[PDB]
């Protein structure tokens, strides 16, 4: 397979010279709709839903999970930033999970999980 | 001499040169085909196509 | 010719080249087709030839050799650049497979496949379609009939938006999925959105 | 924006070819067979033209999205959208005039 | 006179008896390959024909090559006696398993060493050969392939003539066109420089070359003395001396090389007399001998040009210039002298499949021979054996390349038996070795008076390939040399003789040909002293009934097979007949085929020879018959079983079925049809159904070629068609992992995956809709950090990253129906798959299509149409007895298009359907004098036939229409004129005037509306150009060309044109912005610069052209 002559994208295909092969090659980037519309829409829905989280919880997500500054700060790192321990934050995280999975929040976020 | 020039520019240049004393240039009207007319009056960008 | 050059204010030195440019790679893409077989435009081959000749010239100059071989390789580089800018404009065109001529750089502009004539042939547009036409005498002069299967797929953004706004869908993704599935809730909105 | 009064053409000179180009092509290698990615100073190098993936670095030092206009000192590549790869130019240096 | 035992009985309006039955309609395709391979049947056929030397194709090609030897003369090899082996697997297995129908061939190679005098001979394997099935087709990689014959100009001598514009003096130009070698042009010019153009060189005088050949000057003087211009040219040449002439020739051909007598002589011999470098096909040498009348008394063995030929050509040129009517040469008989015609079929030969395959194998064998000689010149001479010498790779490679990519190896279209039969019978005039569309002039696309009986002048493609693609006439046959022959019965002394002879173009030209329609007494005496006759070239004039020399066989001799089954073809126009013939090849096989009420006698023979109907090989008695298979007990005690393929996808999407039409305990005679394939009712072609037609405009729904159909057709499945799609996916190994098909798919609901089985494929018989998953597969993944929220959602729900992506094959857009069959090939089971693949599965989806708006219908007379509306059965006009009409056709399109034959077909169809009983108590009426005695009485729904150019005259129809039987109610609907008083379906009141009614045969074309509908709001885009694009699965955008831009500019519309070319075509960011804006409430933004202009600038700069846009100030601008 490594020993093979490549096909020049400029050879005619169909033999009528109505187009050369390089014409019929798709891209592999964000489509006009695939990512653009869904990415922007879920970003706006993020500004709507992830904003509903408490201010302290909003910062928790922004740092440990990485909304604002990225770099998901491990429980130890975010604890260093806030002074909290690795065990206490887990209970608040699970409470946030329980809060989000019920109601309009989960209804909004289902579409972006599939 | 012997170069085709549009009437407007030729007349304007002739008036400009004559007003300062330069002698007039003798020319006669001439028609030409659509192909040559298009080539004479067009952009190089449009001419290449 | 000489008067055209004199009026310019530039120099005729531009005819002799000392640095040939290269088009950006996206204009000459190397893409992996299905079956893991590589594909690439001939521009890459021509650029490879020119680069190899230039590097060999540099190596010969660095080491040093009798002027016969150096002159031969200089002729080689000149002919390679000539082939790059145009194949067949002079001499025997280069052909790797099946004695087929490599589409030179200037060939992208001239000929039937050139960019100028292709642009003169127009472009392919979105939000369009075609179908057979059947006479309908029930229509007014300012009317036409569009099959729903075509209107739905052609008005997709408008109809999906309006469907979202009527609360039939919670967001854009659900609306797109429903339009693709063509649920019965889409036809009313589609009739509403092409008034 | 879209004010183009005139469009002119001229004969490029050694200096003009270099000014358009962002980098010089030194070697003919097109792609690395094992990593399927462009080679240093080849016909596809990111150092010359641009990054293959948007907001990505060749070595990954500055792979995060929040690096705009920062050239990675480790590999000297720019961090911008992949579409720049269709815009930026290069130039070869002829050892003898042609 | 039904040749086949069990033909349906359909009386015909035949007033003449054909002395010769139609030959095997596929004989042209089969005989060529039979000659190629070489079989006893071909050998005995050739011996019967009287050929002195029966030589096959393979043996000829590899005999002319032998004996290959080295220059030193110490080595030499030969191989001959080519014989084949048995086939690998049956045709069904090869087609089902994707194999190639072939059979290996062996050649005995005798290796001889001259110095020692030793012999080493043994059989040599030479790859596989793509044998041809009985239907005259090649099964390549499981796909049916048919190679169409080609028309090329036979090698020989052509004496062209051109007239000077100024001198106004005839200029006679001669051209020799060998199969392979130099080209000679002995052309006389105003300056009188009669010269030779060898390989397009300067016009050196012919005398110089002639003396260079050793021709003494006094011989030139004596032989050419009768010529004055040539004598003066002989006196004008300056260079003299054999050595000087040879050196001049060498310099003109190869200047700057050592000029020597030996080198010049060797070059001349190599260029002209050497067989390898310069060769003339046997046909070429035969034609040259006939033209010049030299060496006619002996069989042709030497196939190379000789000095006698050149001198004879020059003599012919000078004599023709003199104006001589004929010339004679020592050893040659008197022959005429005239300019040749290129388009004549006496000069255009036909190279069938045998010729093409022979040429390809010859090329492969020569390529092999080069390497063989190179290897043998270097390898050791002691322990050399032919086995290690012969290389088989190049020959098989050439054969495969020809069968795969050659333009003369096309997919055999399989809409219906007629389409396949016509494709096998095609006569291509383009492709490799022939003319190209652009280069070829328009003078070759016209008809020639020599096409009568050889090439059908009606049938032809309507597109740009008009005149370059025809079809063999019904009776045309291909002579061994390749010239198309036609039958004729010779008249000896004014009495027609039963025995027939086949005449080619030249023989036809030199004789006199009668006309079949010319009346002849039962004793063979021409009643008319003067009979219409056809002469040399497009000349027809009355001649005494004694000078006539030859007579045709049937009036249908000049029509193809497709055109021979258009009733009342003699009444339609040529263009309309062409359109009807072409459309007869696009019919879609329905579910229940019905034989036509009115149709020529070609239906049955075309159906039988099309190969789509199984015909018993030997007479026997059927033991048990079942839908799947039938078993017949032969009279000799041996039982045979015919397996009938059912619901098998054709080559173009249609379905092929074979329903038996025999009952248990029936004795079937040999050659009787057993089951009917697609488009066949009781062993006769049936492309469509019979519909009751009323010709009238109806409220504008049938306006301008539109058609109105009764809903009875839709609800009765009259025009219901079955189509079988085909999808396939493969699991190819990747450097990153191996793809595997599994039922489990990442992140999909169970409801969607409710139809897939454990293996991961859809269960048979499960309805599949648009966008549904058809087979689930998972592809390996590398490393790609999840987006923040996507990774979070993965964490919350316990759904792991599941790196493997989804690439499951899904039903493309606009497909539906059951899943009739699934075929899976796995590398584990030792199956042949392409390199790098392990699991290949293909799923067949079958859809049943009912006629609806947009589907195309058309009769046999070239009158297309589209279903404008499908009215309820209660709205259609109905006859006086309550029989609603099934279709309405506009009357404004019949007379304008001048295809009046359709009305006559309608009248005859009504007469046949209702049945007629000609009054005979007082005696046969005058108009019925010529009607066959069996045609005076018919039963309702009878079958009638009107052979082309010989059928029911108008008087016959006028008489029949007034004698139709009454209905069961005791009333006659149609009047004598053929019109009937209809009742309106909506208003309920009778129409003021009577309307034409009758049964017309209506087909269903393959230009269905389902495939044509196309839409695209936003899909994938190209890569280099970034314009809209995408396979027809996701549909591609339309083409807004230049004329569509001038139309927009003329309107004064400027914003629409700015949009259609920038915001929805090329803008990379404008497209996304506008899609967001439409999917949002905001306005549409302003378009930017098209990428097709940025690309243009970035490319124009790369040519070292400094292109920079500037403002009024002259400042360079950034883009
Ligand atoms: Zn880096």
Read out DSSP for E826-885? EGGGT----TTEEEEEEEEEEEEE---TT-BEE-TTS---EEEEEE-TTTS-B-TTS-B-
Q: Check contact A-B (3+ Cβ pairs < 8 Å).
A: no
Rounded CA separation E847/E722 (Å) = 6
Q: Confirm if C39 and C31 have CB atoms less than 8 A apart.
A: yes
| H or E segment to which residue E823 belongs | strand E818-826
What distances in angstroms separate CA E1075 from CA C166, E665, E1016, E1026, E1086, one per listed residue?
Answer: 20, 72, 14, 16, 13
Sequence-ordered list of residues with C-beta below 8 angstroms from that of C144, at least 6 positions apart, any chain: none
Q: Confirm if C51 and C57 have CB atoms less than 8 A apart.
A: no
Phi-psi region of E1058 (alpha: psi -120 to 50; beta: other; left: phi over 0): alpha
Residue ranges with CB less than 5 Å from ion ligand 1: D 57, 59, 61, 72, 74-75
Question: Chain A closest CA to C151's CA: distance in Å?
Answer: 19
| H or E segment to which residue E574 belongs | helix E574-583
Experimental technique for the deposited model: cryo-EM
Other CB atoms within 10 A of residue D56 CB? 18
Binding residue numbers of D for Zn(2+)? 57, 59, 72, 75
Partner D, chain A 91-110, Cβ-Cβ below 8 Å: none
To test the contact with chain D by mutation, choose from A28, A29, A36 the residue with the greatest count of D C-beta atoms within 10 A, namely A29
Partner B, chain C 108-137, Cβ-Cβ below 8 Å: 109, 116-117, 119-120
Out of C22, C124, C137, name the one closest to residue E1065 (CB): C124
Binding residue numbers of D? 57, 59, 72, 75
What distances in angstroms separate CA C174 from CA C164, E574, E663, E792, one per listed residue?
Answer: 9, 59, 59, 20
Rounded CA separation C180/A34 (Å) = 14
Separation of D59 CA from ligand 1 center, angstroms? 4
β-strand partners of E140: E143
Separation of E54 CA from ligand 1 center, angstroms? 78
Q: What three-state secondary structure class fits E191? A: coil
Q: Confirm if E946 and E567 have CB atoms less than 8 A apart.
A: yes
To test the contact with chain C by mutation, choose from D28, D46, D49 the residue with the greatest count of C C-beta atoms within 10 A, namely D28
Taking contacts as CB-CB distances below 8 angstroms, the residues of chain C near E1041 are 121-122
Question: Chain B closest CA to C108's CA: distance in Å?
Answer: 12
Separation of E203 CA from ligand 1 center, angstroms? 71
Instruction: Judge: A70–D64 Cβ closer than 8 Å, yes or no.
Output: yes
Instruction: Judge: D14–C20 Cβ closer than 8 Å, yes or no.
Output: no
Question: Chain D closest CA to A64's CA: distance in Å?
Answer: 16
Separation of D68 CA from ligand 1 center, angstroms? 13
Q: Confirm if C156 and C179 have CB atoms less than 8 A apart.
A: yes
Does A75 contact chain E (CB < 8 Å)?
A: no
∠ Cα C36 C41 C43 (to 5°): 140
Does C157 contact chain E (CB < 8 Å)?
A: yes
Rg (C-alpha) for chain D, rounded Å, is 16
Q: What tokens appear for E333 in the block?
A: 């008989």
Q: Does domain E153-350 have CATH number 3.90.1110.10?
A: yes
Taking contacts as CB-CB distances below 8 angstroms, the residues of chain A near C100 are 11
> DSSP label at E1059?
I
Instruction: Judge: E1072–A32 Cβ closer than 8 Å, yes or no.
Output: yes
Rounded CA separation A46/E4 (Å) = 80
Taking contacts as CB-CB distances below 8 angstroms, the residues of chain A near C44 are none
Question: Chain C closest CA to B49's CA: distance in Å?
Answer: 5
* Resolution to one decimal, Å: 3.4
Q: Confirm if E119 and E110 have CB atoms less than 8 A apart.
A: yes
Question: Chain B closest CA to C175's CA: distance in Å?
Answer: 46
What distances in angstroms separate CA E72 from CA E69, E100, E373, E376, one per listed residue?
Answer: 8, 43, 12, 12
Out of C17, C50, C82, name the one closest to residue D97 (CB): C17
Q: Confirm if E159 and E340 have CB atoms less than 8 A apart.
A: yes
Separation of E127 CA from ligand 1 center, angstroms? 56
> DSSP label at E520?
-
Instruction: Judge: E1105–D10 Cβ closer than 8 Å, yes or no.
Output: yes
Separation of D66 CA from ligand 1 center, angstroms? 14
Complete DSSP assignment for D7-34? EEEEE--HHHHHHHEEEE-------BTT
Sign (positive/negative) of CA torsion D53, D59, D64, D70? negative
Q: Confirm if E33 and E620 have CB atoms less than 8 A apart.
A: no
Q: What are phi and psi of D43, to 5 degrees?
A: -85, 0
Angle of helix C156-165 relative to helix C185-193, nearest 10 degrees, comes to: 110
- Pairing between strand E944-945 and E11-12? parallel
Interface chains of chain A (3 or more CB pairs under 8 Å): C, D, E
| H or E segment to which residue E161 belongs | strand E156-163
Instruction: Judge: D8–E1107 Cβ closer than 8 Å, yes or no.
Output: yes
By CA distance, what is B48's nearest residue in C? C116
Rounded CA separation E491/E333 (Å) = 27
Interface chains of chain B (3 or more CB pairs under 8 Å): C
Rounded CA separation E923/E918 (Å) = 10
Q: Confirm if E293 and E287 have CB atoms less than 8 A apart.
A: no
Q: Confirm if E61 and E365 have CB atoms less than 8 A apart.
A: yes
Q: Count of CB contacts below 8 A, D vs E?
A: 46
Instruction: Judge: E1105–D5 Cβ closer than 8 Å, yes or no.
Output: no
> DSSP label at A12?
B
Sequence-ordered list of residues with C-beta below 8 angstroms from that of C90, at least 6 positions apart, any chain: C82
Rounded CA separation E386/C99 (Å) = 33
Rounded CA separation E467/E830 (Å) = 50
Rounded CA separation D98/C77 (Å) = 8
Q: Confirm if E920 and E592 have CB atoms less than 8 A apart.
A: no
Question: Chain A closest CA to C114's CA: distance in Å?
Answer: 12
Rounded CA separation A39/A30 (Å) = 10
Separation of A73 CA from ligand 1 center, angstroms? 23
Rounded CA separation C66/C77 (Å) = 17
Instruction: Judge: D33–A2 Cβ closer than 8 Å, yes or no.
Output: yes
Sequence-ordered list of residues with C-beta below 8 angstroms from that of E838, at least 6 positions apart, any chain: E731, E732, E733, E738, E826, E827, E828
By CA distance, what is B47's nearest residue in C? C116
Q: What three-state secondary structure class fits C110? A: coil
Instruction: Judge: C16–D93 Cβ closer than 8 Å, yes or no.
Output: no
User: Is the N-terminal amide bond of E627 cis, ω within 30° of 0?
Assistant: no
Q: Confirm if E887 and E708 have CB atoms less than 8 A apart.
A: yes
Rounded CA separation E951/E649 (Å) = 38
Does A19 contact chain E (CB < 8 Å)?
A: no
Separation of D73 CA from ligand 1 center, angstroms? 7
Does C167 contact chain A (CB < 8 Å)?
A: no
Q: What three-state secondary structure class fits E342? A: coil
Separation of D19 CA from ligand 1 center, angstroms? 25
Rounded CA separation E486/E477 (Å) = 6
Tokens 């809209």: give the residue. Answer: E1028
């Amino acid at each position: 397979e490594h020993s093979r002559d490549p096909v020049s994208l400029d050879m005619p295909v169909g033999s009528e010279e109505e187009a050369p092969l390089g014409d019929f090659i798709e891209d592999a980037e964000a489509m006009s709709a695939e990512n653009a519309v869904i990415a922007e829409l879920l970003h706006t829905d993020i500004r709507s839903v992830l904003a509903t989280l408490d201010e302290r919880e909003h910062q928790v997500i922004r740092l440990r999970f990485g909304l604002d500054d990225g770099q998901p700060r491990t429980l130890d790192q975010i604890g260093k930033l806030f002074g909290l321990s690795r065990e206490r934050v887990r209970q608040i995280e699970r409470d946030v999970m329980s809060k989000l999975r019920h109601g309009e929040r989960a209804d909004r976020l289902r579409s972006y999980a599939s | 001499p012997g170069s085709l020039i549009d009437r407007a520019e030729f007349e304007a240049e002739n008036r400009r040169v004559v007003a300062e004393g330069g002698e007039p240039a003798a020319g006669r009207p001439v028609l030409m085909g659509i192909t040559k007319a298009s080539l004479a009056t067009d952009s190089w960008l449009s001419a290449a196509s | 010719v000489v008067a055209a050059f004199q009026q310019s204010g530039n120099s005729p030195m531009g005819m002799v080249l000392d640095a040939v440019p290269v088009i950006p790679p996206e204009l000459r893409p190397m893409v992996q087709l299905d079956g893991g077989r590589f594909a690439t435009s001939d521009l890459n081959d021509l650029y490879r030839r020119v680069i190899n000749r230039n590097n060999r010239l540099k190596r010969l100059i660095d080491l040093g050799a009798p002027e016969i071989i150096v002159n031969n390789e200089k002729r080689m580089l000149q002919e390679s650049v000539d082939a790059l800018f145009d194949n067949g404009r002079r001499g025997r065109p280069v052909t790797g497979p099946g004695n087929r001529p490599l589409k030179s750089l200037s060939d992208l502009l001239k000929g039937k496949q050139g960019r100028f004539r292709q642009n003169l042939l127009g472009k392919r547009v979105d939000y369009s379609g075609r179908s057979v036409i059947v006479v309908g005498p029930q229509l007014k002069l300012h009317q036409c009939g569009l099959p729903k299967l075509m209107a739905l797929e052609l008005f997709k953004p408008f109809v999906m938006k309006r469907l979202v706004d009527l609360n039939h869908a919670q967001n854009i993704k659900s609306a797109k999925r429903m339009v693709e599935r063509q649920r019965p809730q889409v036809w009313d909105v589609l009739e509403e959105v092409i008034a | 924006v879209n004010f183009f009064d005139e469009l002119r053409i001229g004969l490029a000179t050694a200096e003009d070819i270099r000014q358009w180009s962002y980098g010089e092509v030194k070697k003919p290698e097109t792609i690395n067979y094992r990593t399927l990615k462009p080679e240093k100073d080849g016909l596809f190098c990111e150092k010359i033209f641009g990054p293959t993936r948007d907001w990505e670095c060749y070595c990954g030092k500055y792979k995060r999205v929040r690096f705009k206009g920062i050239i990675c000192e480790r590999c000297g590549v720019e961090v911008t959208r992949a579409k720049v790869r269709r815009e930026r130019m290069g130039h070869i240096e002829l050892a003898a005039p042609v | 006179n039904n040749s086949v035992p069990g033909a349906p009985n359909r009386v015909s309006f035949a007033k003449l008896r054909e002395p010769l039955e139609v030959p095997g309609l596929l004989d042209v395709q089969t005989d060529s390959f039979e000659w190629l391979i070489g079989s006893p049947r071909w050998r005995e056929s050739a011996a019967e024909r009287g050929d002195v030397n029966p030589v096959g194709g393979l043996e000829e090609v590899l005999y002319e090559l032998s004996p290959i030897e080295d220059f030193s003369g110490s080595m030499s090899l030969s191989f001959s006696d080519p014989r084949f082996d048995d086939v690998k697997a049956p045709v069904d297995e090869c087609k089902d398993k994707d194999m190639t129908y072939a059979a290996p061939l062996f050649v005995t190679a005798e290796f001889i060493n001259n110095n020692t005098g030793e012999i080493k001979s043994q059989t040599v394997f030479m790859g596989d050969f793509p044998m041809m099935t009985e239907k005259g087709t090649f099964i390549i990689n499981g796909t049916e392939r048919v190679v169409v014959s080609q028309l090329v100009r036979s090698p020989g001598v052509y004496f062209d003539e051109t007239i000077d514009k100024s001198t106004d003096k005839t200029l006679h130009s001669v051209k020799v066109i060998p199969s392979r070698g130099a080209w000679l042009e002995f052309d006389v010019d105003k300056r009188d420089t009669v010269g030779v153009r060898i390989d397009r060189k300067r016009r050196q005088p012919v005398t110089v070359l002639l003396k260079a050949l050793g021709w003494t000057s006094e011989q030139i003087v004596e032989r050419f003395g009768f010529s004055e211009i040539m004598r003066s040219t002989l006196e004008k040449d300056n260079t003299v001396g054999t050595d000087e002439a040879l050196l001049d020739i060498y310099r003109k051909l190869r200047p700057g090389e050592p000029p020597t007598k030996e080198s010049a002589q060797t070059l001349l011999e190599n260029l002209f007399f050497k067989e390898k470098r310069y060769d003339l096909a046997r046909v070429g040498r035969y034609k040259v001998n006939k033209k010049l009348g030299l060496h006619v008394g002996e069989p042709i063995t030497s196939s190379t040009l000789t000095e006698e030929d050149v001198v004879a050509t020059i003599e012919y040129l000078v004599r023709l210039h003199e104006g001589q009517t004929t010339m004679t040469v020592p050893g040659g008989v008197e022959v005429p002298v005239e300019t040749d015609d290129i388009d004549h079929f006496g000069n255009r030969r036909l190279r069938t499949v045998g010729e093409l395959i022979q040429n390809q194998i010859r090329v492969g064998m020569s390529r092999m021979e080069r390497v063989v000689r190179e290897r043998m010149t270097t390898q050791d001479v002691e322990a050399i054996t032919p086995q290690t010498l012969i290389n088989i790779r190049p020959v098989v490679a050439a054969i495969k390349e020809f069968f795969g990519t050659s333009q003369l190896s096309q997919f055999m279209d399989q809409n219906n038996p007629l389409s396949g039969l016509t494709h096998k019978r095609r006569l291509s005039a383009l492709g490799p070795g022939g003319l190209s569309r652009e280069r070829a002039g328009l003078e070759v696309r016209d008809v020639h008076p020599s096409h009568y009986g050889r090439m059908c002048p009606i049938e032809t493609p309507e597109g740009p390939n008009i005149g370059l693609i025809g079809s063999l006439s019904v009776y045309a046959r291909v002579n061994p040399f390749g010239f198309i022959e036609t039958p004729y019965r010779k008249v000896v002394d004014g009495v027609v003789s039963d025995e027939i002879v086949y005449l080619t173009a030249d023989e036809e030209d030199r004789h006199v040909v009668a006309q079949a329609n010319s009346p002849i007494d039962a004793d063979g005496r021409f009643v008319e002293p003067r009979v219409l006759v056809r002469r040399k070239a497009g000349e027809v004039e009355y001649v005494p009934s004694s000078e006539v020399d030859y007579m045709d066989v049937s009036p249908r001799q000049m029509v193809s097979v497709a055109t021979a089954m258009i009733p009342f073809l003699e009444h339609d126009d040529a263009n309309r007949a062409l359109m009807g013939a072409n459309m007869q090849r696009q019919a879609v096989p329905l579910v229940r085929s019905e034989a036509p009420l009115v149709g020529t006698g070609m239906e049955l023979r075309a159906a039988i020879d099309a190969g789509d109907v199984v015909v018993a090989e030997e007479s026997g008695v059927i033991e048990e018959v079942s839908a799947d298979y039938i078993t017949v007990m032969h009279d000799n005690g041996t039982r045979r079983t015919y397996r009938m393929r059912k619901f098998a996808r054709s080559n173009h999407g249609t379905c092929a079925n074979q329903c038996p039409i025999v009952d248990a305990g029936d004795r079937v005679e040999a050659g009787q049809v057993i089951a009917d394939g697609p488009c066949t009712d009781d062993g006769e072609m049936a492309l469509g159904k019979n519909l009751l037609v009323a010709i009238m405009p109806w409220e504008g729904h049938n306006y301008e070629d539109a058609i109105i159909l009764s809903n009875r057709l839709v609800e009765e499945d009259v025009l219901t068609s079955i189509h079988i799609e085909e999808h396939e996916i493969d699991a190819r190994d990747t450097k990153l992992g191996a793809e595997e098909i599994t039922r489990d798919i990442p992140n999909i609901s169970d409801e969607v995956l409710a139809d897939l089985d454990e293996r991961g494929i859809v269960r048979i018989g499960a309805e599949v809709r648009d966008g549904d998953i058809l087979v689930g597969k998972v592809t390996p993944k590398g490393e790609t950090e999840l987006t923040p929220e996507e990774r979070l959602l993965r964490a919350i729900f316990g759904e792991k990253a599941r790196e493997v992506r989804d690439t499951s094959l899904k039903v493309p857009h606009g497909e539906s129906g059951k899943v009739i069959g699934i075929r899976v090939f796995s590398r584990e089971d030792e199956d042949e798959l392409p390199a790098g693949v392990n699991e290949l599965v293909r799923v067949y989806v079958a859809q049943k299509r009912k006629i609806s708006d947009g589907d195309k219908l058309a009769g046999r007379h070239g009158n297309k149409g589209v279903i404008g509306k499908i009215l309820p059965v209660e709205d259609m006009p109905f006859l006086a007895d309550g029989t609603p009409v099934d279709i309405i056709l506009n009357t404004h399109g019949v007379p304008r298009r001048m295809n009046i034959g359709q009305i006559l077909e309608t009248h005859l169809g009504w007469c046949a359907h209702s049945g007629w009983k000609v009054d005979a108590a007082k005696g046969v009426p005058d108009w019925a004098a010529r009607l066959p005695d069996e045609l005076l009485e018919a039963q309702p729904n009878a079958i009638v036939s009107t052979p082309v150019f010989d059928g029911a005259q108008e008087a016959e129809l006028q008489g029949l229409l007034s004698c139709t039987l009454p209905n069961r109610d005791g009333d006659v609907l149609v009047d004598a004129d053929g019109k009937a008083m209809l009742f309106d379906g909506r208003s309920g009141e009778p129409f003021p005037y009577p309307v034409t009614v009758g049964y017309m045969y209506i087909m269903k074309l393959h230009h269905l509306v389902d495939d044509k509908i196309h839409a695209r709001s936003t899909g994938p885009y190209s890569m280099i150009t970034q314009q809209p694009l995408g396979g027809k699965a996701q549909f591609g955008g339309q083409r807004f060309g230049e004329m569509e831009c001038w139309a927009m500019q003329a309107y004064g519309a400027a914003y629409t044109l700015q949009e259609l070319l920038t915001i929805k075509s090329d803008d990379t960011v404008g497209r996304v912005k506008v899609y967001e804006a439409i999917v949002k409430g905001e306005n549409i933004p302003e378009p930017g610069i098209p990428e097709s202009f940025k690309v243009l600038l970035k490319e124009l700069q790369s040519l070292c052209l400094n292109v920079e846009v500037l403002s009024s100030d002259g400042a360079a601008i950034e883009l």
